[PDB]
Amino acid sequence: SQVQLVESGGGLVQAGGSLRLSCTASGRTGTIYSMAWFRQAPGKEREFLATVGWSSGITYYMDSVKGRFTISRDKGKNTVYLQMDSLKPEDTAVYYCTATRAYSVGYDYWGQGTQVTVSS
Amino acid sequence: QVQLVESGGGLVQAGGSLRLSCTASGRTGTIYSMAWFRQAPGKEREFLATVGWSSGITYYMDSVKGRFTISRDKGKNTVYLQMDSLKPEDTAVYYCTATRAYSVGYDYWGQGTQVTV
Numbered sequence A: 001s002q003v004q005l006v007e008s009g010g011g012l013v014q015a016g017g018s019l020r021l022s023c024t025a026s027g028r029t030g031t032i033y034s035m036a037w038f039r040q041a042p043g044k045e046r047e048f049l050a051t052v053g054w055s056s057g058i059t060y061y062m063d064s065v066k067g068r069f070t071i072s073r074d075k076g077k078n079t080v081y082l083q084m085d086s087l088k089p090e091d092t093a094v095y096y097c098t099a100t101r102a103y104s105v106g107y108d109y110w111g112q113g114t115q116v117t118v119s120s
Numbered sequence B: 001q002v003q004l005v006e007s008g009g010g011l012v013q014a015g016g017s018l019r020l021s022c023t024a025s026g027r028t029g030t031i032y033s034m035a036w037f038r039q040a041p042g043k044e045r046e047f048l049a050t051v052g053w054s055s056g057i058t059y060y061m062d063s064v065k066g067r068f069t070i071s072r073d074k075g076k077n078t079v080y081l082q083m084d085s086l087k088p089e090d091t092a093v094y095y096c097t098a099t100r101a102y103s104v105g106y107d108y109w110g111q112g113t114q115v116t117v
């Protein structure tokens, strides 16, 4: 793979708590147009959550996470973040980061995910 | 600056097929890609598939890959979602979107069309 992604930052918290996910990209990172976070709860489909423009830092959020989660990136460190506040049990899932290449569409590169568990 | 109107859908028998379409009007030259989402009752909007407006390159989520086909006719300003091998859990309101060049996410949304399997 010309770009490799590794997510970290997951773990177990109680409801009301916070986590900060991160994902480092390596390889041909100059080809990245945007990065996005998804999550997959057990037995469910992958759900798109939020995206950030790699060059611009412009962001877009789905209503499921808007106003609790913040996506950002430190371009010089080739790292994207997902700040997750006011976590609820229903946020429990494997969280994946992805990259979309310039002149492509969709989600070209995927990490292996990081587990997020929110208990009562 | 861009308006989207979806057509197609309605009641369809399981195992069958439906083709949805969406026509864009306005500043269509600014469109980089278009994408279909769906929302089952009481659930979140789920991203399904996208097509590059200039190139026709496509991407599908695993939920629909190998069953739905997305395509576009640039001259007619129209994008299509061919839905084959439909299953009960495909019942949802289907929404088409457009993303402007140099934007991110989903800038323009249609009003949706119901598909009931």
Ligand SMILES: Cn1c(=O)c2c(ncn2C)n(C)c1=O
Pocket (backbone or CB within 6 Å): A033, A034, A100, A101, A102, A103, A104, A105, B032, B033, B099, B100, B101, B102, B103, B104
């Ligand atoms: C919206 N958009 C663009 O506008 C774009 C792009 N790659 C190049 N451009 C211009 N990608 C991947 C993209 O999603």
